[PDB]
Design a protein around this ligand. Structure first.
Ligand code: AMP
Lengths: 336, 6
């Protein structure tokens, strides 16, 4: 395709602005927050704390208007190169009518986070056409103890800072964990589980990748902030810390919306701490029941979700997915 | 967590 507007690559010493569009994690998990900031500061970045850092409004950081103001102040700040959520929650979608999309279009930046921040990552892409990034949120991702935080950091640098020739191969992490330990304080080493991706349904697909957190997508679906899924797109979806009933609802939501009639392939993230409700079924097995007799190439257990470590994934750019050989390549520039 | 958060 034609060259398009893109954000500048991250550079050492750049300022990362952090904001809390939903849960007040900088108040409720202060140790992991302080550790995450120090991790990135020690690497040589600067952190600009958004205006709701340290504030507390129970389930949220502040009112809808306060949270929009926090994010817009970073969007409008020409000294900020990367805007990163501290954590998700449920309520990022409340901000969407109030975000300064024109200011973002005037001065594009790296927009990164995951889970509930999907509402904003997809909303910005929908309104501006600028690719956004499914990737680290400050406290869950960079507050992680060694060793996994170093793998997450490596992928973050490789995708956002290093120059990359195209096609850009996304390598499989060698080890993973989803253990529900070591949140504020470390009590033992997480298991270094040997890692694999899964070839659920063979084949290849090339298309624009669209998606993120599927639970969160249901809170923006149908609105101006949800990019239209187009014939040939690759669907990227993940859920984390849910159960079989919840993800069957979300998979059937996609099915009855015709999404599976359009997409050329599906990338499914790992499912942290999945509750199979006694069925012993895997998330991809429930998805495949929803798919019925429709064959779609499908690569599962992709490391772009709440499990550690986390890949940084551009959204809104052409990708090739090979479910038979379990490869993912990015085919279009996502940064200058 | 007791929550339904993402
Ligand atoms: P959302 O963006 O809220 O959560 C994303 C992942 O962060 C981890 N997480 C959030 N909050 C906690 C607490 N309080 N304890 C342990 N882990 C937490 C999970 O990995 C979430 O899926």
């Amino acid at each position: 395709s034609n060259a398009m507007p893109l954000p500048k690559s991250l550079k050492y010493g750049d300022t990362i602005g952090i904001y809390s569009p939903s849960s007040p994690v900088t108040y409720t998990s202060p140790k992991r927050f302080e550790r995450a900031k120090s991790y990135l500061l020690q690497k040589g970045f600067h952190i600009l704390e958004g205006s709701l850092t340290g504030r507390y409004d129970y389930y949220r950081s502040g009112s809808i208007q306060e949270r929009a103001k926090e994010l817009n102040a970073l969007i409008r700040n020409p000294n900020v190169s990367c805007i990163m959520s501290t954590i998700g929650g449920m309520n990022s979608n409340s901000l969407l009518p109030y975000i300064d999309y024109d200011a973002f279009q005037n001065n594009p930046k790296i927009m990164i986070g995951y889970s509930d921040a999907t509402a904003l990552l997809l909303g910005i892409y929908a309104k501006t056409g600028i690719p956004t990034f499914y990737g680290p949120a400050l406290v869950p991702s960079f507050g992680e103890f060694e060793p996994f935080v170093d793998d997450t950091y490596k992928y973050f640098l490789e995708t956002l800072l290093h120059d990359q020739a195209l096609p850009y191969n996304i390598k499989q992490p060698l080890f993973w964990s989803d253990e529900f330990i070591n949140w504020e304080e470390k009590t033992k080493e997480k298991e270094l589980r040997p890692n694999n991706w899964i070839s659920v349904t063979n084949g290849q697909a090339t298309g624009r990748v669209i998606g993120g957190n599927l639970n969160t997508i249901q809170g923006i679906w149908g609105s101006p902030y949800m990019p239209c899924i187009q014939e040939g797109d690759i669907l990227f979806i993940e859920d984390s810390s849910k159960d079989a009933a919840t993800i069957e609802r979300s998979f059937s939501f996609l099915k009855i919306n015709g999404v599976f009639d359009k997409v050329s392939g599906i990338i499914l993230g790992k499912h942290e701490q999945f509750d199979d409700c006694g069925t012993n079924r895997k998330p991809y097995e429930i998805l495949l029941e929803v798919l019925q007799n429709q064959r779609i190439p499908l690569l599962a257990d992709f490391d772009c979700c709440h499990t550690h470590p986390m890949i940084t994934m551009p959204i809104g750019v052409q990708v090739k997915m090979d479910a038979t050989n379990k490869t993912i390549h990015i085919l279009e520039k996502w940064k200058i | 967590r007791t929550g339904n958060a993402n």
